[PDB]
Amino acid sequence: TRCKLKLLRMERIKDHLLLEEEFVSNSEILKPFEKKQEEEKKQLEEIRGNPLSIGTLEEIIDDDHAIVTSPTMPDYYVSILSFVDKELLEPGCSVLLHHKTMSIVGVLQDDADPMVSVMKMDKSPTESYSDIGGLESQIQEIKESVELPLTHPELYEEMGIKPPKGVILYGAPGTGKTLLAKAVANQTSATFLRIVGSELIQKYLGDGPRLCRQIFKVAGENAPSIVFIDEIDAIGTKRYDSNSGGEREIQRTMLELLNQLDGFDDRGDVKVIMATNKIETLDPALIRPGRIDRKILFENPDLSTKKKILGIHTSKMNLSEDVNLETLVTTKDDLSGADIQAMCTEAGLLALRERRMQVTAEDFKQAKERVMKNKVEENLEGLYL
Amino acid sequence: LRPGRIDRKIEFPPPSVAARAEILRIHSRKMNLTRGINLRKVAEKMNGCSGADVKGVCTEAGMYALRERRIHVTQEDFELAVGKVMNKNQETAI
Amino acid sequence: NALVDILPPDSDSSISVMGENEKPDVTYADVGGLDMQKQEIREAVELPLVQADLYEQIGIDPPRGVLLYGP
Amino acid sequence: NDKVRFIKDELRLLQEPGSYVGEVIKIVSDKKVLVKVQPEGKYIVDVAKDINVKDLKASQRVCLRSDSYMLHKVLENKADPLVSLMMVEKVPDSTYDMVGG
Amino acid sequence: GSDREVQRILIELLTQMDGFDQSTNVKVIMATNRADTLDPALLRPGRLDRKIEFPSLRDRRERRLIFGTIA
Numbered sequence: 033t034r035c036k037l038k039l040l041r042m043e044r045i046k047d048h049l050l051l052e053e054e055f056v057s058n059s060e061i062l063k064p065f066e067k068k069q070e071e072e073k074k075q076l077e078e079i080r081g082n083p084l085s086i087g088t089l090e091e092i093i094d095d096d097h098a099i100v101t102s103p104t105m106p107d108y109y110v111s112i113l114s115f116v117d118k119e120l121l122e123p124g125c126s127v128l129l130h131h132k133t134m135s136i137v138g139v140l141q142d143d144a145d146p147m148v149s150v151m152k153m154d155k156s157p158t159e160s161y162s163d164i165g166g167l168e169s170q171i172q173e174i175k176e177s178v179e180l181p182l183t184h185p186e187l188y189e190e191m192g193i194k195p196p197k198g199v200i201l202y203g204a205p206g207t208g209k210t211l212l213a214k215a216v217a218n219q220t221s222a223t224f225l226r227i228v229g230s231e232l233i234q235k236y237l238g239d240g241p242r243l244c245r246q247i248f249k250v251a252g253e254n255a256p257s258i259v260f261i262d263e264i265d266a267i268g269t270k271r272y273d274s275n276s277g278g279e280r281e282i283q284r285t286m287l288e289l290l291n292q293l294d295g296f297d298d299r300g301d302v303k304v305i306m307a308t309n310k311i312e313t314l315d316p317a318l319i320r321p322g323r324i325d326r327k328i329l330f331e332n333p334d335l336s337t338k339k340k341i342l343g344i345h346t347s348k349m350n351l352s353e354d355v356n357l358e359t360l361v362t363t364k365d366d367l368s369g370a371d372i373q374a375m376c377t378e379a380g381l382l383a384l385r386e387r388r389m390q391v392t393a394e395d396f397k398q399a400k401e402r403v404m405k406n407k408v409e410e411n412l413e414g415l416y417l
Numbered sequence: 418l419r420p421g422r423i424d425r426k427i428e429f430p431p432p433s434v435a436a437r438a439e440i441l442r443i444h445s446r447k448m449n450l451t452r453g454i455n456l457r458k459v460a461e462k463m464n465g466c467s468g469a470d471v472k473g474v475c476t477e478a479g480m481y482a483l484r485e486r487r488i489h490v491t492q493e494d495f496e497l498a499v500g501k502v503m504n505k506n507q508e509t510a511i
Numbered sequence: 512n513a514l515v516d517i518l519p520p521d522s523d524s525s526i527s528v529m530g531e532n533e534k535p536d537v538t539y540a541d542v543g544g545l546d547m548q549k550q551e552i553r554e555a556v557e558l559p560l561v562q563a564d565l566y567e568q569i570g571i572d573p574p575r576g577v578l579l580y581g582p
Numbered sequence: 583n584d585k586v587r588f589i590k591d592e593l594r595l596l597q598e599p600g601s602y603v604g605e606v607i608k609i610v611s612d613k614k615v616l617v618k619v620q621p622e623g624k625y626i627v628d629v630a631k632d633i634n635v636k637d638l639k640a641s642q643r644v645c646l647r648s649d650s651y652m653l654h655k656v657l658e659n660k661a662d663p664l665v666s667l668m669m670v671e672k673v674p675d676s677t678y679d680m681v682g683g
Numbered sequence: 684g685s686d687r688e689v690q691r692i693l694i695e696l697l698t699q700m701d702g703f704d705q706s707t708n709v710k711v712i713m714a715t716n717r718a719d720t721l722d723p724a725l726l727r728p729g730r731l732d733r734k735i736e737f738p739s740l741r742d743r744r745e746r747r748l749i750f751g752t753i754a
């Protein structure tokens with residue numbers, strides 16, 4: 033209550049004062065700037081004028097020439113002159129030419145793409161570890177290889193040897209795999225890239241291999257990084273025809289997935305994190321340990337772990353003395369954690385239909401009957417074979 | 418449908434005799450109606466499956482009164498129309 | 512580069528109309544069969560040009576575009 | 583007298599060395615605007631003393647004078663790109679009483 | 684580029700069939716030989732409404748007529 037508001041007012045007396053001070057000293061207080069900043073801005077602007085025509089650099093020559101290609105088309109053999117550094121010149125880069133005699137007046141151009149938008153993430157999850165609590169020691173193997181060599185460089189120099197790489201998450205569904213990943217990217221606060229494995233198969237042919245070579249050049253740049261390939265099982269069935277899938281498209285994705293993660297390339301820091309529920313279809317050139325170190329195995333939790341799990345979800349709901357929290361856990365006999373989460377979303381859906389705004393012992397024992405009927409109606413064994 | 422992804426499932430019934438007569442009534446207002454026309458008698462003759470059927474009988478009757486060169490849509494046109502629409506749907510679904 | 516006058520929408524057209532040229536050589540004597548599609552085309556095409564006033568006074572909308580498809 | 587002096591001066595106003603329609607990709611805090619001439623390639627070119635780079639927002643269709651590509655005015659026109667995709671699809675909306683029964 | 688010219692034409696063709704509504708002209712007739720390449724926005728209502736299928740089995744009274752006019 034008060035804790036939050038003291039700090040929020042403290043950063044709105046910082047933001048206000050700094051903006052008034054920093055605006056006044058660019059428009060009135062000029063002494064280390066003044067003459068010397070008015071001469072440098074005047075020289076660079078006059079010398080190149082405007083309009084400036086953006087080009088794309090195909091190749092450099094080291095005697096200070098370049099072959100640039102306009103994007104319209106007409107090619108040009110331009111000169112590298114004045115107010116330019118050759119440290120940023122290189123293929124693919126965007127340069128400014130003077131619209132009459134085209135000389136490279138400088139490089140400052142980087143123009144964001146809608147193909148680098150889909151890959152990069154803006155998110156900051158609203159859950160952090162210990163909303164996953166339970167299966168406690170399964171996030172305490174992903175913290176030994178993702179978080180821990182960044183935080184303490186000391187311990188991995190003290191033992192020596194190369195540090196771990198990667199992890200695979202596989203196992204029973206309803207064991208939280210998707211939120212486990214969404215928690216190791218929020219703790220560290222490293223640049224978290226995120227791609228589903230089903231975008232790597234597209235109707236277009238051989239477009240697979242170009243897309244994931246792109247993903248890893250973006251990742252190497254922002255390094256240190258975490259790459260989520262969520263659902264790399266999906267590459268096993270999703271296909272649009274038999275050549276947009278089939279041996280053809282599945283081999284192209286392997287080959288690619290193999291180069292990015294270990295090749296001649298001599299990759300910088302990409303940690304990889306994969307979500308999956310198929311281990312017996314993966315490349316045998318990845319579950320080769322020594323790309324991917326400790327793999328994590330997940331199973332349905334047991335009755336005391338499911339007591340820690342039902343306590344995270346039931347504080348959300350309205351609380352009463354009537355509620356029998358311990359007896360929903362007991363009756364369930366190694367049932368997953370995705371059901372426990374479908375039962376507390378079902379308790380406030382029955383509660384709203386009544387228009388009674390208390391969640392009590394009656395609303396939870398009714399919501400368990402609806403959750404056990406969908407999975408049990410789909411069991412058409414009836415009289416046990 | 419991994420457990421906990423879906424919280425509402427809306428099944429859509431084929432049309433009841435109260436559901437078929439309320440869709441038929443909204444379209445009937447553009448047509449002309451002379452006194453004596455019950456829209457409940459037409460709604461019990463049909464059986465429907467869909468809300469495309471219930472609107473296409475009323476649309477078919479505005480085509481018989483056009484051919485006739487009759488401004489008003491009176492009660493012979495909806496006898497012919499129920500006969501064409503039900504006969505058409507038994508001969509494309511067979 | 513200034514708009515100094517307008518031109519009729521009849522003028523500067525891709526194609527001269529063909530209704531002023533001579534009429535196609537086929538008439539209804541050479542149509543044989545397909546008598547079932549012939550009653551659905553005299554209604555859809557012919558009747559909304561000559562008499563727009565039969566559709567509107569009933570309150571029905573005439574069919575808009577006509578598609579022909581087959582082998 | 584006013585009338586014969588509207589015509590004589592309208593002869594000067596109708597002469598245009600050239601004027602394009604561009605669109606603002608992105609601004610830069612150099613007091614320059616990156617404008618895409620809409621059939622061609624891109625050009626970075628600063629603003630005239632008629633407007634500020636505070637007023638120009640992303641994907642705003644602007645006026646350009648093809649003499650040095652100097653921004654004259656903001657152009658009135660501009661369509662949302664989503665208004666475009668929703669309309670070529672075309673999908674009616676309804677109310678609850680016309681889907682009732 | 685050749686996909687971007689085909690596609691600009693077709694988008695323009697939908698927006699001009701909309702304007703064409705409420706004019707005495709009966710909206711464009713068009714034909715296709717294989718109807719299974721038909722883009723979904725074109726056939727959607729508001730542009731095309733009627734689908735005159737042209738059978739090829741026909742009966743014995745409608746085949747006779749086709750013989751009788753070529754005879």
Ligand SMILES: Nc1ncnc2c1ncn2[C@@H]1O[C@H](COP(=O)(O)OP(=O)(O)OP(=O)(O)O)[C@@H](O)[C@H]1O
Nearest residue numbers: 164165166167205206207208209210211369373419
């Ligand atoms: N062991 C656990 N501890 C705490 N919360 C859990 C646990 N298991 C599941 N949950 C809760 O269940 C929710 C649904 O899980 P999620 O959708 O991430 O599971 P999943 O195993 O990734 O499913 P899938 O099998 O479809 O890949 C989680 O977001 C999480 O809060």
Ligand SMILES: [Mg+2]
Nearest residue numbers: 209210211307
């Ligand atoms: Mg998941």
